[PDB]
Design an enzyme around this catalytic site. Structure first.
Site, PDB file in Angstrom:
ATOM      1  N   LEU C  41       1.260  -0.853   0.336  1.00  0.00           N
ATOM      2  CA  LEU C  41       0.056  -0.225  -0.036  1.00  0.00           C
ATOM      3  C   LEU C  41       0.786   1.045   0.120  1.00  0.00           C
ATOM      4  O   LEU C  41       2.458   1.140   0.757  1.00  0.00           O
ATOM      5  CB  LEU C  41      -1.170   0.055   1.150  1.00  0.00           C
ATOM      6  CG  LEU C  41      -2.437  -0.981   0.950  1.00  0.00           C
ATOM      7  CD1 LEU C  41      -3.191  -0.645   0.094  1.00  0.00           C
ATOM      8  CD2 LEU C  41      -1.960  -1.947   1.030  1.00  0.00           C
ATOM      9  N   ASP C  42       0.397   2.395  -0.803  1.00  0.00           N
ATOM     10  CA  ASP C  42       0.643   3.248  -0.883  1.00  0.00           C
ATOM     11  C   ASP C  42       0.993   4.395   0.532  1.00  0.00           C
ATOM     12  O   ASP C  42       0.520   3.771   1.218  1.00  0.00           O
ATOM     13  CB  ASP C  42      -0.088   4.235  -1.694  1.00  0.00           C
ATOM     14  CG  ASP C  42       0.367   4.120  -3.320  1.00  0.00           C
ATOM     15  OD1 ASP C  42       1.243   3.192  -3.163  1.00  0.00           O
ATOM     16  OD2 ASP C  42      -0.580   4.311  -3.857  1.00  0.00           O
TER      17      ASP C  42
END
Ligand code: 3PE
Ligand code: 3PE
Ligand code: 3PE
Ligand code: 3PE
Ligand code: 3PE
Lengths: 481, 71, 85, 83, 124, 89, 52
Positions: C41-42
């Site tokens: 995930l960013d």
């Protein structure tokens, strides 16, 4: 009798070692005796009734029946009887409120307390200027000693204030009393409305008398000693001072000033109204920024006395009756609040800073109920004598001067502000972290507070019950042509 | 017919209701007292007083018409 | 009334992550999975996830604590530590 | 739901979730006192009750107004706005 | 330090800490405190005017500046009152004359007397 | 029921205190009687109003005017004003 | 609470509450209809009292 009773006192002291039971018994007997006197008091007459004279030359050590009266005069009418009943009600509670928290030189402490109470009670019996003044000053040495020995941390400065401010006012009172003595060659209260001094002389005497009244009531701007003396006094000193010694001022107006200096009083009344409106508004506002419990309770009394003064100089029957009822109700309520802040909270935590206290309801619900009741009584809830006094006093003041009385009606709001701001923080919130849990109010504390609450409620629901003693008085002092 | 001052006092008509037909007010109020002020009843008397007030307001709007016409 | 259990929290969080689209895979979501590493995930996507978690359990995360949770275990234990959840 | 609370704290309201084990019998006592007080006062205050109108007669009212006029004529009393 | 009344007190302190006061209501409520309700930790110094900045102090609102909120309040009141007052001018006239009453406006029944019928008495 | 004899300040020598007290008390008692007259008026007005309702104006005009008239004069005024001043001079 | 992020089941509501709802709604609508019918001219505004 006196010899035998002295023997009894000595033996009780030798065997028990603590006089305080004897003093409690004695004060209760005095209360019963005054009630007997009330029973035998004729109310259909405006004349002093239980008269006696002391230190007359023919009988220095007894009572005088001589045809020349050069001693000191004592006697009572309804106005004196009301305050005497208040006094004898308050004294045993004053003894009882310190029943356990004095553990050193306790006999001396109780002696000073009972002596001060007796001095005030006798002061109410005085019938001439000189004896009135004598018993009016006699408390100051006792208050000084009591506050200095049994007071809190700042008690030395407190004792010096309570002696010096009251002496300062009393000596100007003495100037006025000396002028009256040498001008009239009489001093009595029985017939002193019969002497009509020249207007200029009245205007001059009134100044000394009213300076004494300013220091003792107190009124703005010389009220700054009272909050101190209260905060550092022990509980008995604070209760007596708030409940009786201030009412001595109001009694002083009615007895010494109004019958003799009527025309000068008429001339000076707007100045009195200026000073009373000042004391109400300014002291009520100054109460908002205090951080000590006992100091806030002390500041409340000054404002209520301001309303009392506005009532008593209104030249109306309603105003005078309101001033008296307010004095009595204040003598019931203020000792109760002082009991709370300086005998329950102070004896449990030995601190008076407001920041420490919060959320007392959780552990001590009964104390919280008492705080709520007493505070709504202090701010003048109807069915309490305080409301009747403030309402009638405000009626008289509004009649005497519509603008000034109308503005004075702001006292209701101001009183609510400071008192409820205090009780809000004290009762609610989460229990304070700084203090730990302690016992709830005990049987003795609850007994005292119940006495005061029922008294104020009784005269608040039916204030008429005082009228039988006061219906002459409400006409004896108003000056209408 | 316009009520007598004595009659109008005797029935204790309210001051604002004392007009040219308080005469119909009296029976209407009596009916409204016998029934318990219930909406469905006293219909005839209620309508009768209202029809007074119609005639009454009508003479008023005509009087204002005349006043307007003068200007 | 209504009381939640640790497993109920975990199940709700697993379903939440399952329905999120920017995830790498659904099957790879483990109890000790790292959103930054495992699910990839960013920076902001985990922020979107913590907002979703608070919106789902009806709580409010301070800034200092939201950024502290990095694994799903941390999230489940944090949500179980709060009484009104 | 519920939580622990200090048992030593005695409040006349009862405190936390007060539900005494003999509450039904105390309840009988309470309702007995309630009916007693309500009935006693309802009967006791009965003599002090009266209707608003019909208490005095028109005779008294008219004669009192006439007497008031007599008083206002013995003194020099004009009416309001009578000027 | 920030407010004029706190600045006024600076000569009146000697050897007491000149604290910058911060409204305790605006301290964010998620930090931990010894007394959570008052958002104060133990032995934290108190400003001289503390009683104006604790939690028990009157609530402060951050949305509008005080001056700006004053502008809005006065603006709403002015526009409302002025619009109403100007609307009074553009008013239709009625259609029915005001009602009247017998006996010169019932001046007898509202008290009144022959010598004073103007004080008490209707439109007739 | 006591009916003490009435005394006036004008006749008396102020050096006999018994007479002076009697004068003060008599003046007060007369003021209280005047109050009773005012209250009787007011009670009659209340009964009048309550029974007359809408026409209370006409029915009770006399009582209302009389009560409003006696209000400023039938209160207490106290004896000091009159004993300390002699109105003749 | 078997299903999450999924379609929700039809809510279960007591018989009494549905019956109360039907009665209250029926009564309000019927009362409103009756009132409009009975007062139509006066509530809508008809039969002007002014002279023609
Ligand atoms: C230190 C300060 C300055 C001191 C200055 C003055 C000090 C005075 C010392 C206290 C002595 C006063 C109290 C006793 C005097 C009264 C005794 C008495 O017998 O009362 C006289 C009065 C008339 O009695 P009689 O005419 O004989 O007829 C009887 C019919 N069966 O009979 C009565 O009507 C009863 C009167 C009741 C009086 C109540 C007094 C209240 C308090 C009593 C004790 C006070 C002691 C004070 C101690 C502190 C000092 C002030
Ligand atoms: C600072 C402190 C200041 C302190 C001030 C207090 C001063 C105290 C002075 C006491 C004198 C006042 C006494 C009040 C009179 C009460 C009384 O009557 O006592 C009885 C007796 C005389 O009584 P008699 O004259 O016969 O009248 C009664 C008729 N039914 O009376 C007697 O026989 C005299 C007995 C009293 C002796 C007191 C001696 C001093 C005290 C030590
Ligand atoms: C005197 C006549 C009137 C007194 C009335 C009461 C008599 C009984 C008094 C009493 O109960 O005891 C007083 C007090 C306590 O006795 P005790 O327990 O033995 O003292 C502890 C150390 N022994 O005994 C003592 O401890 C005495 C200690 C004296 C305290 C010194 C400072 C007090 C000064 C009092 C101020 C007086 C100023 C006078 C000016 C006008 C006052 C009216
Ligand atoms: C006319 C006079 C009427 C006089 C009424 C007689 C008083 C008897 C009732 C007082 C008992 C109420 C009480 O104990 O309140 C305590 C309450 C905490 O009690 P609780 O709710 O059980 O527990 C919470 C945490 N323990 O603590 C609180 O929250 C304080 C609430 C006090 C309620 C008092 C009600 C009286 C209000 C009228 C005051 C008017 C004063 C004049
Ligand atoms: C037209 C003009 C309107 C006048 C209204 C009357 C003003 C007095 C009202 C005082 C008051 O209500 O303050 C209560 C205040 C609570 O306010 P707040 O903190 O915002 O409440 C949060 C709850 N959600 O709690 C407090 O701040 C209490 C602290 C004292 C409040 C009064 C301070 C005195 C200032 C002058 C008041 C008005 C003086 C007379 C006018």
């Amino acid at each position: 009798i006196l010899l035998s009773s002295l023997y009894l006192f000595n033996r009780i002291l030798a065997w028990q070692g603590n006089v305080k039971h004897f003093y409690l018994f004695a004060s209760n007997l005095l209360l019963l005796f005054i009630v007997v006197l009330y029973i035998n008091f004729n109310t259909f007459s405006n004349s002093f009734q239980f008269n006696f004279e002391l230190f007359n030359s023919l009988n220095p050590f007894g009572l005088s029946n001589s045809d020349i009266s050069n001693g000191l005069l004592f006697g009572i009418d309804g106005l004196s009887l009301t305050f005497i009943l208040l006094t004898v009600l308050l004294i045993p509670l004053t003894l009882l409120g310190n029943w356990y928290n004095i553990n050193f030189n306790s006999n001396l402490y109780y002696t000073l307390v009972l002596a001060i109470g007796l001095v005030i009670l006798l002061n109410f019996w005085a019938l001439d200027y000189i004896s009135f003044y004598i018993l009016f000053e006699a408390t100051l040495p006792l208050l000084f000693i009591l506050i200095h020995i049994y007071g809190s941390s700042d008690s030395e400065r407190a004792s010096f204030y309570v002696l010096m401010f009251t002496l300062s006012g009393s000596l100007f009172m003495l100037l006025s009393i000396v002028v009256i003595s040498i001008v009239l060659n009489t001093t009595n209260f029985i017939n002193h409305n019969l002497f009509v001094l020249s207007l200029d002389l009245q205007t001059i005497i009134w100044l000394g008398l009213f300076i004494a009244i300013m220091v003792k009531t107190p009124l703005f701007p010389i009220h700054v000693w009272l909050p101190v003396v209260h905060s550092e006094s022990p509980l008995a000193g604070s209760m007596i001072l708030a409940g009786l010694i201030l009412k001595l001022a109001l009694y002083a107006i009615l007895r010494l000033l109004l019958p003799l200096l009527c025309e000068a009083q008429i001339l000076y009344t707007p100045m009195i109204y200026i000073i009373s409106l000042l004391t109400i508004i300014l002291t009520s506002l100054a109460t908002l920024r205090q951080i000590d419990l006992k100091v806030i309770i002390a500041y409340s009394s000054i404002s209520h006395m301001g309303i009392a003064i506005l009532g008593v100089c209104s030249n109306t029957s309603l105003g005078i009756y309101g001033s008296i009822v307010l004095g009595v109700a204040h003598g019931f309520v203020s000792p109760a609040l002082f009991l709370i802040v300086g005998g329950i909270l102070y004896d449990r935590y030995h601190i008076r800073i407001v920041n420490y206290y919060k959320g007392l309801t959780t552990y001590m619900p009964q104390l919280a109920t008492y705080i709520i009741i007493l505070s709504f009584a202090n701010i003048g809830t109807p069915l309490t004598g305080n409301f009747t006094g403030e309402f009638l006093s405000l009626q008289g003041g509004f009649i005497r001067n519509p603008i000034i009385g109308g503005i004075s009606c702001i006292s209701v709001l101001l009183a609510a502000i400071y008192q409820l701001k205090l009780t809000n923080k004290l009762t609610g919130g989460i229990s304070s972290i700084y203090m730990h849990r302690t016992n709830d109010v005990t049987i003795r504390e609850k007994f005292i507070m119940n006495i005061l609450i029922i008294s104020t409620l009784i005269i608040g629901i039916c204030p008429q019950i005082m009228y039988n003693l006061l219906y002459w008085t409400v006409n004896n002092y108003i000056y209408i042509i | 017919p316009l009520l007598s001052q004595e009659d109008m006092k005797k029935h204790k008509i309210l001051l604002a209701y004392r007009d040219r037909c308080a005469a119909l007010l009296v029976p209407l109020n009596e009916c409204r007292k016998k029934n318990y002020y219930m909406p469905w009843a006293c219909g005839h008397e209620r309508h009768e007083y209202e029809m007074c007030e119609v005639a009454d307001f009508q003479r008023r709007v005509k009087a204002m018409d005349k006043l307007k016409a003068e200007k | 009334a209504h009381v939640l259990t640790k497993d109920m929290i975990q199940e709700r969080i697993v379903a939440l992550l399952e329905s999120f689209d920017k995830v790498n895979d659904a099957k790879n979501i483990t109890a000790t999975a790292n959103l930054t590493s495992d699910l990839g995930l960013d920076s902001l996507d985990v922020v979107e996830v913590v907002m979703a978690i608070e919106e789902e359990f009806g709580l409010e995360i301070p800034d200092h604590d939201a950024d502290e949770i990095k694994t799903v275990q941390q999230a489940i234990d944090y949500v179980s530590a709060q009484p009104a959840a | 739901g519920r939580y622990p609370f200090p048992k030593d704290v005695i409040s006349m309201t009862g405190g936390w979730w007060a539900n005494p084990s003999n509450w039904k019998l105390n309840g009988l006592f309470a309702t007995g006192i309630a009916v007693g007080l309500a009935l006693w006062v309802s009967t006791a205050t009965l003599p002090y009750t009266r209707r608003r109108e019909g208490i005095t007669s028109e005779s008294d009212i008219s004669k009192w107004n006439a007497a008031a006029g007599v008083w206002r004529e013995r003194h020099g009393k004009i009416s309001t706005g009578e000027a | 330090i920030r407010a004029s009344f706190d600045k006024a007190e600076e000569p009146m302190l000697g050897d007491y800490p000149d604290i910058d006061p911060f409204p305790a209501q605006l301290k964010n409520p998620y930090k931990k405190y010894d007394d959570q309700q008052d958002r104060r930790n133990l032995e934290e110094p108190l400003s001289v005017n503390d009683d104006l900045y604790d939690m028990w102090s009157p609530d402060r609102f951050t949305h509008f500046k005080n001056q700006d909120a004053l502008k809005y309040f006065i603006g709403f009141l002015t526009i409302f009152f002025g619009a109403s007052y100007v609307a009074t001018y553009f008013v239709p006239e009625k259609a029915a004359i005001p009602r009247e009453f017998p006996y010169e406006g019932l001046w007898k029944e509202s008290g009144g007397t022959e010598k004073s019928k103007a004080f008490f008495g209707q439109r007739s | 029921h006591q009916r003490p004899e009435l005394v006036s300040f004008d006749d008396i020598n102020y050096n006999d205190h018994k007479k002076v007290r009697e004068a003060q008390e008599s003046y007060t008692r007369e003021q209280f009687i005047r109050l009773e007259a005012l209250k009787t008026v007011r009670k009659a007005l209340e009964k009048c109003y309550e029974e007359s309702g809408p026409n209370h104006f006409e029915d009770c005009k006399n009582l209302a005017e009389q009560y409003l008239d006696m209000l400023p004069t039938h209160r207490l005024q106290g004896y000091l004003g009159y004993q300390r001043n002699d109105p003749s001079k | 609470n078997y299903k999450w992020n999924g379609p929700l089941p039809r809510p279960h509501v007591s018989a009494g509450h549905r019956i109360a709802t039907k009665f209250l709604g029926a009564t309000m609508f019927f009362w409103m209809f009756l009132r409009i019918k009975e007062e139509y001219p006066a509530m809508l505004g008809l039969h002007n009292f002014y002279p023609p």
